[model samples]
Target: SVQPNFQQDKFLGRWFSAGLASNSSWLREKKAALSMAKSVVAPATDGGLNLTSTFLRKNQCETRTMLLQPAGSLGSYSYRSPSTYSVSVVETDYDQYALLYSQGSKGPGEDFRMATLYSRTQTPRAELKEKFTAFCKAQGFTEDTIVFLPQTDKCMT
Candidate 1:
């Protein structure tokens, strides 16, 4: 029964999901980002730790929704939110741990337990990782979302 705080005219931009987690109902590992445009609408609703997502991933330059769950406190797992965010095009973070620009759910199929890690840098430091974990826990994300993004080193730097 939650509605997104969305607006079409002012909801176009770029955002990156920082962390995530999932309950037993969650599905597979999903990763993605959201690019809101003039035609996009961001719901100014509370996604909760139980509800389901309408979109779950990016597909060939388009947005797609996926997954399902009961619904919990959405704000906890996500922060640094724009007081007046406006995003219409929805994508999948493919996670139940958090729903920054994306939505979370218990997942509707197999291989659903999922998480995400995003940044513009070549590598994330221990401090940042800890912060992300803290945020995740604070936002209701379980230890699962803080799993890790395996990287040998700053490869793309």
Candidate 2:
């Protein structure tokens, strides 16, 4: 479920990738090598949001930016990048962590789903990890598909 009365402005800030769960096989294979990533959310001129994420891969820093166009709901957004995507703010406290759910579809039989937990700090509370796990399970994600990103300082810049 999307956050009730979600405040878009309050959600804008730097967020650390604390945990993630997906139904994709790619994540199953790459999760072990993945580390915590950082993201900055800012308002766009078109009343949307710009998400800029930075991470380290193969000892190299990589950055990616995506513009999320506001959907009909207050906390719903859509993105298009070859594959069509829809994302929702599942929950957030603005000061602690934010939970997001996204679905991507390239074509028939090519749909994928993911859940992300973004925290205010690189290391989040133990309860938060449990919460993420529970949420992922509710979304039909299995234990092997969920992963808590390891803390890293490689892409702070």
Candidate 3:
């Protein structure tokens, strides 16, 4: 239940995944530097987000767009499609960097949990990465659970 001092509109536009923390083997296999390569968080009138996430996986470029609705609390949102998620915006500047967490199970015995550090720029600042590392640790995530994504030339343009 991490809440950011959020200004929803300010969070709109593209974001890059600077790092990731997760237990999913599927995620570990993913070259997600370009997966979640560019994400657009837009304002929805329903006090939620219109999310468009783009990625490159298995020699293909994939895009997923979904509507996320507020989940009866501050900084919490949910979406059901491909999977169901309880999403939280843990921290953000609403300009440069953001930390997002998602937890859910797609079906029986299919649990998924992931945290991503997002940056407005392709390469986030060092301090932001440090802060994200500490934040993840405070939330009980061990180093082995986190994977730092690369800043590749494939997506910035």
Candidate 4:
């Protein structure tokens, strides 16, 4: 479910990826090498969202930007990279942490779900982690499918 009384402006700014839970095979294969990713969220002119994310991949800093079109709701957005996906802001305090849920299609008859925890800082509180875990479990993610992102200094600018 989307956050009640979702505040778009309050959700905008810089956030660091703290944890993730997903059933995607790619994530399972690369979880060990994956590190924290930094993202900047900005409001779009069309009442959507512009998201820019940066991360280190194989010792090289890479960045990507995506435009999320509003999905007829304040906290819900959808985008496509040839593969369509929907993302929703499940909960957030705005100042500390935010929880997001996403569903995407890999191909015909193949779908995947993901949950992400983002924090204002790289390190988040233990309780927030527990909360994220519970939420992921509620979404049918298994224990081995959840991971706390490792921090890295290579991508900070």
User: Deviation in angstroms for 36 in model 3?
Assistant: 4.4
RMSD of 2: 1.9
Task: Estimate, for each residue in 41-107, the C-alpha lDDT of model 2 and write its tens digit.
Answer: 9998889999998877777778889999888799999888746788899999999988999987454
Show model 1 residue runs off by greater than 4 Å: 1-20, 24-101, 104-115, 151-157
TM-score of each: 0.33, 0.90, 0.81, 0.90
lDDT of residue 69 for candidate 2: 89
lDDT of candidate model 3 versus the reference? 0.77
Q: Is candidate 1 or candidate 3 better by lDDT?
A: 3
RMSD of each: 11.8, 1.9, 2.7, 2.0
Candidate 1 per-residue lDDT over residues 36-126, each given as its tens digit: 1111113344441222122222422334332222133322232222121211122222221112333422233232333333433324457
What is the C-alpha local distance difference test score of each model?
0.33, 0.85, 0.77, 0.85
For residues 87-111, could you state the per-residue lDDT of candidate 3 as single tens digits? 8898888888989988884554247
> Ten-residue segment with the worst summed lDDT in candidate 4?
104-113
Task: State each candidate's clash count.
Answer: 39, 0, 0, 0
Model 4 lDDT per residue over 1-157, tens place: 9999999999999998888888897765675575656889999877899989888778777888889989988899987773778889999999999999988744541377889999998866899899999999999999988888876766777
Error of 2 at 5 (Å): 0.7
Q: Compare candidates 3 and 4 on TM-score and give the better one.
A: 4
